[PDB]
DNA sequence: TTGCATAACGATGCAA
DNA sequence: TTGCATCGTTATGCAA
DNA sequence: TTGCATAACGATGCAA
DNA sequence: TTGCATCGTTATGCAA
DNA sequence: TTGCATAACGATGCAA
DNA sequence: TTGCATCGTTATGCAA
């Protein structure tokens, strides 16, 4: 559940990372992070945003683009609830376990939250390395994920 | 007819201990009905009959679940796939024997893995990239039929 | 007074009036003598690359055709960027049935494939990148060979 | 070469990570980690395990599932023999090189061995990062892999 | 004096003379009586596995057919290595249309697929590896089923 | 722009990592790292190298192979110019950001440069972890990449 | 216990 | 939709 | 602001 | 190449 | 040494 | 299975 402004920020973010051909598709992309709105609302959002359905010559039907921290943290905490199997740490690294295939998904949500204490993440398949920004330790990071769980 | 023979079968199974299809044939014959092993294989396949046994339990006997599950093994490979399709299938498209499923960025592997686990008879295999999954349809299913099958769970 | 001529009438009408719907462009062309249905306008605008434009809070757009000078701040160089990376990274092409197979230097397939996706080609249903190989699925009735030749001609 | 009990533990592990449609297929999966048995033996294993060939309605032919450290270390040492090109280290990380494409394969075998001194692994393509559990260092880890080689 | 016999003449002529071109092998076979065009020689050399060899700074090669004893230092065991890993890692095969689908243990698909690419099979247009699955695209008119059976027979 | 000898070393490297079926293809692979030569030159290179177009029985048309630090650093610096969005660090790790999909590409170029202070790299999608060799820190590595940029 | 050889069982392309 | 014929898959008697 | 119901608008398979 | 018929996609009047 | 233009060489769809 | 005709691929004479 997010307000007009929060939802639109997410829309802008979605439109840059995905090729969105229709408003129904945009609604599915938002529902994946727990934002449920109808098509009417998205028509209004995209208009307020100045989003245009852009295509070149012989370019088919078009995809929406809007011309020119994220918060953000809620998407992540949502996914942590769902995909975080375990945490552990060593030195400046937290190590997170997710179900198989889920690591890139969780890690991308972590990146987008832009935590001040996270230098970066790398996802394999069911594992994520989270690099702690000094002097934060991996143990503290792990503590932060266990708390936001 | 068919739907009626299958009712005879659901009934015979949950009241006797059938260990082979030929055995179910002779049982249905005594009750009047004449079908071959071929047809029983087809019916049990449609019914979702499974040959069951516990640890050291020998050759199983056929049982059809009543949407109440198998003992501890979740036949919700399918239920889990449907749930993740509901959460993550963004759109579908197709070409020839291929269905192409789109997901949010980074989620394709997670969905594709749930699809593999469900072991659909009409899927030969899947490949996940980052936001795209290619699903190969088993002849004579087309990519379009397979896509619509995934759409109807979206 | 054929197609290429009607499309010149259209480029002209658009950049001098404010057309908000295809039916509206139909009646405009009718006054100027020409009779075409909405179907045909949809096809022409698609070929012209006409886009319905508006700014922030700008309502229902009006049609405009770029003159290879871009859209305002949104780079219609999804295609230009794809062509540049094809130039840099497409090593060879091949095909089978509905599939084009593109080869790149080792490790570059994801980076190229991502630029192809962003370009959102009408004839591409999707792509999958491995490490040095990209599979591109052609939209019927385009064949993998036509799609490969299309990528070759940018190589 | 493993005994009835070791082989069956491996079978249970295989059945959860793969979709196994036939006993011949199960034999190939076991041969990949150097366990060679015949189909007769697998029929007997699967029976002792209570494994059932499960399918839903209109669900085709079925895949085997059994209802409800791994050792483990031998699978890994086997693969180390085969895929370990070099080791190196820095701080709390061992860095392992494998031939191209082999890294996920080796790393998954390392994960399943559940070494008490390994917090986790991440595989790229020909490289694996192994995170040492404090106070073990990466150098020691590298020493441990060079020993099990 | 059929195909298998002409190819024996060729294995013989090659390992006793220095043939630098197919036309050259044609005239050599003509002197020995046999009449074939360059087209046919190209086909035979292809089947024989004749390779045009030279060392460093060695110019235009001469044709040689290995006797299952390898090429000098370059392992023609791209194929041997693929067969070995197929034996180790191919768990099952299946097919659809122009695609063979190979299954491996979890995490091994890239390692197998890489060995298959290196072998550079004439009937493979390319491969894509996921985690436990590899998709192999058959070159028309080979089908996915033929390609799968070819991998099966090495399993 | 590289000399006969530098170009040929790159050729040898390319022929082992790719399946090269034709000289035109080899030219595209070299152009991707900014080396532009014609087919005539490559015919001469491959001859000097003793490269042969190798195939087995019924083996089709053949691929080129040559029988039996890289510098190297220039390929990398070129790509750094093009793909390095940002650098950051923690302890013994430098963290590099590239555009999406570009990480494996940049990282492989980093591996091939074989920098004495780099123990190894792992690439995700838009991120690379670079492991610094003790006592070099990640901050210094980051400084080195910011310099070669 | 295990392999082998083989029997019992189940699935499926084809034609009706 | 079914049966036939057949083939792939799984179970099991005996030797070791 | 939002959802709903529905109207307005655009795209496309088919047949000519 | 176009129009027809139709369907998918997007915009918007009203109740809350 | 390199590029260019072009010659020599090899591969392949098609029809017999 | 082959030859024809042709095209893609590789080698090389000359200018710079
Ligand atoms: N199926 C696999 N790729 N397994 C390898 C896992 C290795 C490591 N834990 C990672 O997630 O990167
Ligand atoms: N972050 C990325 N790699 N994006 C590119 C995606 C390319 C292609 N659609 C795939 O899924 O394989
Ligand atoms: N380094 C590797 N993973 N090589 C394997 C490549 C296999 C296949 N061509 C792909 O690109 O997916
Ligand atoms: N084919 C490649 N992507 N090679 C680059 C490997 C880069 C890095 N060492 C990794 O394994 O992730
Ligand atoms: N982590 C997994 N087990 N993924 C399984 C599904 C992935 C899909 N078959 C692929 O190879 O890309
Ligand atoms: N598109 C994605 N898979 N994003 C998740 C990966 C995020 C992480 N920084 C990495 O590159 O591994």
As a whole number of angstroms, the distance between CA A100 and CA E153 comes to 32
Statement to judge: residues A96 and A30 lie in one domain? no
| B35: helix, strand or coil | coil
CATH number at residue E31: 1.10.10.10
Statement to judge: residues C48 and C95 lie in one domain? no
Q: Which of D52, D69, D86 is the last residue of a domain?
A: D69
As a whole number of angstroms, the distance between CA A74 and CA A2 comes to 10
Q: Which of F69, F92, F116 is the last residue of a domain?
A: F69
| Nucleotide with smallest C1' distance to residue D47 CA | H11
End-to-end CA distance of chain D: 18
Structure tokens at B93: 């498209």
CA of A148 to the centre of ligand 3 (A): 38
**Residue D86: domain span:** 70-149
Q: Which of F15, F42, F69 is the last residue of a domain?
A: F69
Statement to judge: residues B47 and B113 lie in one domain? no
Place of tokens 């004893």: E69
Query: How distant is the alpha carbon of residue A128 from its chain centre?
Result: 15
- Residue C81 burial (10 A CB sphere; 0-12, 13-18, 19+): middle
Contact F138, F132 (CB under 8 A): yes
Statement to judge: residues D57 and D104 lie in one domain? no
Statement to judge: residues B76 and B116 lie in one domain? yes
Q: What domain count does chain A have?
A: 2
CATH number at residue B96: 3.30.1360.40
Ligand 3 atom closest to C106 (CA): 1
Nearest-CA distance from A92 to chain B in Å?
Answer: 25
Contact A91, F108 (CB under 8 A): no
- Enumerate the residues of chain D whose CB falls inside 8 A of the CB of residue C131: 101, 125
Statement to judge: residues A105 and A53 lie in one domain? no
As a whole number of angstroms, the distance between CA D75 and CA D115 comes to 13
Place of tokens 């000399």: F3
Statement to judge: residues F86 and F149 lie in one domain? yes
Statement to judge: residues E64 and E83 lie in one domain? no
Place of tokens 């001859």: F47
Phi then psi dihedrals of residue B115, to 5 deg: -70, -40
As a whole number of angstroms, the distance between CA B132 and CA C134 comes to 13
As a whole number of angstroms, the distance between CA A68 and CA F124 comes to 28
Q: Which chains form contacts with chain B, at 3 or more CB pairs under 8 Å?
A: A, C, D, E, F
As a whole number of angstroms, the distance between CA A14 and CA D34 comes to 47
**Nominal resolution (angstroms):** 2.3
CA of C105 to the centre of ligand 3 (A): 11
The protein residue with its alpha carbon nearest to ligand 4, atom 1, reads C107
The DSSP output letter for D56 is -
Statement to judge: residues E90 and E134 lie in one domain? yes
Technique used by the depositors: X-ray
As a whole number of angstroms, the distance between CA F63 and CA C92 comes to 14
Statement to judge: residues C97 and C44 lie in one domain? no
**Backbone region of residue B56 per phi and psi (left: phi > 0; alpha: psi in -120 to 50; beta: other values):** left
As a whole number of angstroms, the distance between CA E11 and CA E29 comes to 11
Residue D133: which residues within 8 A CB-CB, separation 6 or more? A90, D116, D117, D118, D119
Percentages (nearest 5) of helix, strand, coil residues in chain D: 45, 20, 35
Statement to judge: residues F81 and F95 lie in one domain? yes
- Answer whether any strand G atom is within 7 A of the Cβ of D60: yes
Residue F130 is inside which H or E element, if any?
strand F127-132
The beta-carbon contacts of E141-150 under 8 Å, at least 24 apart in sequence, are: E142/E98, E143/E95, E143/E97, E143/E98, E144/E95, E144/E96, E144/E97, E144/E98, E144/E99, E144/E100, E144/E101, E145/E95, E145/E100, E147/E95, E147/E100, E147/E123, E148/E93, E148/E94, E148/E95, E148/E100, E148/E101, E148/E102, E149/E93, E150/E123
Statement to judge: residues C51 and C75 lie in one domain? no
């Amino acid at each position: 559940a997010a307000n007009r402004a929060g939802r639109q920020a997410r829309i802008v973010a979605i439109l840059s990372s995905a090729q969105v051909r229709s408003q129904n598709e945009l609604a599915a992309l938002l529902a994946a992070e727990g934002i449920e709105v109808t098509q009417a609302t998205l028509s209004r959002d995209l208009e307020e945003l100045g989003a245009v359905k852009l295509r070149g010559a012989d370019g088919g039907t078009g995809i929406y683009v809007v011309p020119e921290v994220s918060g953000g943290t809620d998407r992540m905490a949502r996914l942590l609830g769902e995909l975080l199997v375990s945490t552990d740490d060593s030195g400046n690294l937290a190590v997170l376990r997710t179900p198989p295939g889920a690591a890139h998904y969780l890690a991308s949500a972590i990146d987008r939250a832009a935590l001040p204490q996270v230098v970066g993440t790398i996802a394999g398949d069911d594992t994520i390395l989270v690099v702690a920004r000094e002097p934060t330790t991996g143990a503290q990071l792990a503590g932060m994920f266990e708390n936001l769980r």
